[PDB]
Design a protein around this ligand. Structure first.
Ligand SMILES: O=c1cc(-c2ccc(Cl)cc2)oc2ccccc12
Ligand SMILES: [Zn+2]
Lengths: 161, 47
C-alpha cells in the first residue's frame, strides 16, 4: 500500500524538510560514539511516504486524542531513526519498533534533534555501525531517517539528564 | 509496549543538564505517528 514519491530539491517541501534536518544537528555527550562525528549532512534524497490505510489509522487516532484534549492533538514533526525504517514505512509503527529499554519505558521514541535520531539508525547505541564497514561514523554508507507526524496530546513532562 | 501515564497520551523528555539538547518524546500507541518523509543521507566528515 505504500508509495514513495521523490521530492525535487527545488520543491519548497524538500527545502523545508532539509532545513529541519540540518538545523537540528548538535554535539552529543558521547563524543560521536553512537552516531558518528559530524556537524551536517549530505542529503541525497527526500521521499514522501504515501499510504492511505496508515494515514487513516493515524487521523483516526489523532481525532480521538484531540477530543480528549480540548480539540488539541498537539501534533509535532519529529525525527525517528531505526533499523526497522523499511518495515515502518510499509506497515506503520507498532510494538516491534519500541525502545524496550528507553528511559521513559517501552514506547516509540522520537527526537527534535535529527542527530539524536541518527544515533539509532544502526541500532541502540549505534549497534555495530554500518553493515558494510562496521563503522558507526561511516561517511560513505547511506543512512535513512524518518521525519514523522506525531500526536502528543496531553504530554507528561519528565525533567531529566 | 508500556502505557502512557494515566491521563496522558505521551511523555516529553525535557533536557535538564545539557542546555543545547532539544526534547525527546515517547508515544505508546503506534497509531499516534505517521512516517511522512523518508530522508536518505550521509553524515559529513568535518573539515
Ligand atoms: O529516533 C529515535 C529512535 C529510537 C529507537 C530506539 C530503539 C529502537 Cl529498537 C529503534 C529506535 O530511540 C530514540 C531515543 C530517543 C530519541 C529518538 C530516538
Ligand atoms: Zn559504511
Amino acid at each position: 500500500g505504500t508509495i514513495l514519491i521523490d521530492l525535487s530539491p527545488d520543491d519548497k517541501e524538500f527545502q523545508s524538510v532539509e532545513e529541519e534536518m540540518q538545523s537540528t544537528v548538535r554535539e552529543h555527550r558521547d563524543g560521536g560514539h553512537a552516531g558518528g562525528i559530524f556537524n551536517r549532512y549530505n542529503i541525497l534524497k527526500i521521499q514522501k511516504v504515501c499510504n492511505k490505510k496508515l494515514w487513516e489509522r493515524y487521523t483516526h487516532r489523532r481525532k480521538e486524542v484531540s477530543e480528549e484534549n480540548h480539540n488539541h492533538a498537539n501534533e509535532r514533526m519529529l525525527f525517528h531513526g531505526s533499523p526497522f525504517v523499511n518495515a515502518i514505512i510499509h506497515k506503520g509503527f507498532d510494538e516491534r519498533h519500541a525502545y524496550i529499554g528507553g528511559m521513559f519505558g517501552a514506547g516509540i521514541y522520537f527526537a527534535e534533534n535529527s542527530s539524536k535520531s541518527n544515533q539509532y539508525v544502526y541500532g541502540i547505541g549505534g549497534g555495530t555501525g554500518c553493515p558494510v564497514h562496521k563503522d558507526r561514523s561511516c561517511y560513505i554508507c547511506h543512512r535513512q531517517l524518518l521525519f514523522c507526524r506525531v500526536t502528543l496530546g496531553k504530554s507528561f513532562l519528565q525533567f531529566s539528564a | 509496549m508500556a502505557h502512557s501515564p494515566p491521563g496522558h497520551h505521551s511523555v516529553t523528555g525535557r533536557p535538564s543538564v545539557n542546555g543545547l539538547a532539544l526534547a525527546e518524546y515517547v508515544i505508546y500507541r503506534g497509531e499516534q505517528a505517521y512516517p511522512e518523509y523518508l530522508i536518505t543521507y550521509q553524515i559529513m566528515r568535518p573539515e
